[PDB]
Amino acid sequence: HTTSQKNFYDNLTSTLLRLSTDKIGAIIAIENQDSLESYVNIGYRVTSDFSPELLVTIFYNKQSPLHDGAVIVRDYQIVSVSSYFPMTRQLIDVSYGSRHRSALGLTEKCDAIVFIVSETTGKISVAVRGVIKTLSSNSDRLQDQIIHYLTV
Amino acid sequence: KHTTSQKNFYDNLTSTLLRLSTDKIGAIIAIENQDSLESYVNIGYRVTSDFSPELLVTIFYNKQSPLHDGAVIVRDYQIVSVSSYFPMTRQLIDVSYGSRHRSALGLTEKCDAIVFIVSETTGKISVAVRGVIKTLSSNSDRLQDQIIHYLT
């Protein structure tokens, strides 16, 4: 109930905070009502609990292709890595990179919530319904922000 | 039982062990046969995926994550768990055996699993079956042959 949900919020926060401080680029897409099955089939099917330990294994190896593309999460479980999304059609600030545009592109087509970490700055963003917003790197505020965007 | 499936697994296991070996990365991989290892699966991180050499390498090489410790369990050529621990042997054996070696002996005494080990110290490849451990070759063509032998 609340225990699986709250562990996911704690583990997603911790993971995003880690990738941020280490400036490791990352996309983590969270399925809602719209099926991302097509995009799962584009990447590599891996099923597991959303564990910081597994996401560290993946992302802290720049040689591995698993560190590339997006992680897709369904029902608090990882279902794929290395998934690619369509680019946004919007005119967006130049500061936003490839990952940001793929994330926006996905959310323009369906109800997925996508989090992005910037490899350049370390900043954490969320894309929801064709809108992208920057989240704080402060640990306390970030968790509340993450919960808001996943419960809205 | 399909020929391409077993051949692909044999190649993937061979390339994986040779690489761990040459880079002296500690590893243990248990193959389930007729005796269920479901109890040891539930004790580790449940991770379902194809047996991909890239992913196997990021698991054991990545020292920051605890995933590199303990065993990967394989069922029907698929990964089903990582960081599974096995009971160590209760036989009086030589001190030159480390944790992984005693774990493989321990497991294979209780069931028909086949457990491959790579030493972090020497990079030697061993296999454990029915409570007996033997070193394998680091020649590619031999290792294929030995792997095929022990898995039938």
Swiss-Prot record, chain A:
Question: How would you describe this protein's topology in the membrane?
Answer: Single-pass membrane protein
Sequence ranges assigned to domain DAC in this UniProt record: 1-138
Reported EC number(s) for this entry are 2.7.7.85
**Which GO CC terms are listed, alphabetically?**
plasma membrane
| Record-level GO BP terms | cAMP biosynthetic process
Q: Does the keyword Electron transport apply?
A: no
Q: Where in the cell is it found?
A: Cell membrane
Gene Ontology MF annotations = adenylate cyclase activity; ATP binding; diadenylate cyclase activity
* EC top class, as a word: transferase
Q: Does the keyword Amino-acid biosynthesis apply?
A: no
* UniProt keywords, alphabetically: ATP-binding, Cell membrane, Membrane, Nucleotide-binding, Nucleotidyltransferase, Transferase, Transmembrane, Transmembrane helix
Write down the chemical reaction(s) this protein catalyses.
Answer: 2 ATP = 3',3'-c-di-AMP + 2 diphosphate
Q: What does this protein do?
A: Catalyzes the condensation of 2 ATP molecules into cyclic di-AMP (c-di-AMP), a second messenger used to regulate differing processes in different bacteria.
- Name the family the entry cites: Belongs to the adenylate cyclase family. DacB/CdaS subfamily.
> Quaternary structure?
Probably oligomerizes.
What's this protein's name?
Diadenylate cyclase
Q: What is the lineage of its organism?
A: Bacteria, Bacillati, Mycoplasmatota, Mycoplasmoidales, Mycoplasmoidaceae
Q: Which gene encodes it?
A: dacB
Swiss-Prot record, chain B:
| Lineage: superkingdom | Bacteria
Instruction: Give me the reactions it catalyses.
Output: 2 ATP = 3',3'-c-di-AMP + 2 diphosphate
Query: What region holds the DAC domain?
Result: 1-139
The entry's keywords: ATP-binding, Cell membrane, Membrane, Nucleotide-binding, Nucleotidyltransferase, Transferase, Transmembrane, Transmembrane helix
* Subcellular locations according to the entry: Cell membrane
**Molecular function terms in GO for this entry?**
adenylate cyclase activity; ATP binding; diadenylate cyclase activity
Task: State the oligomer form and interacting partners.
Answer: Probably oligomerizes.
Membrane topology annotation: Single-pass membrane protein
Supply the name of the protein.
Diadenylate cyclase
Report the family membership: Belongs to the adenylate cyclase family. DacB/CdaS subfamily.
Full protein stretch here = 47 to 198 of 202
Give the UniProt record's GO annotations in the biological process aspect.
cAMP biosynthetic process
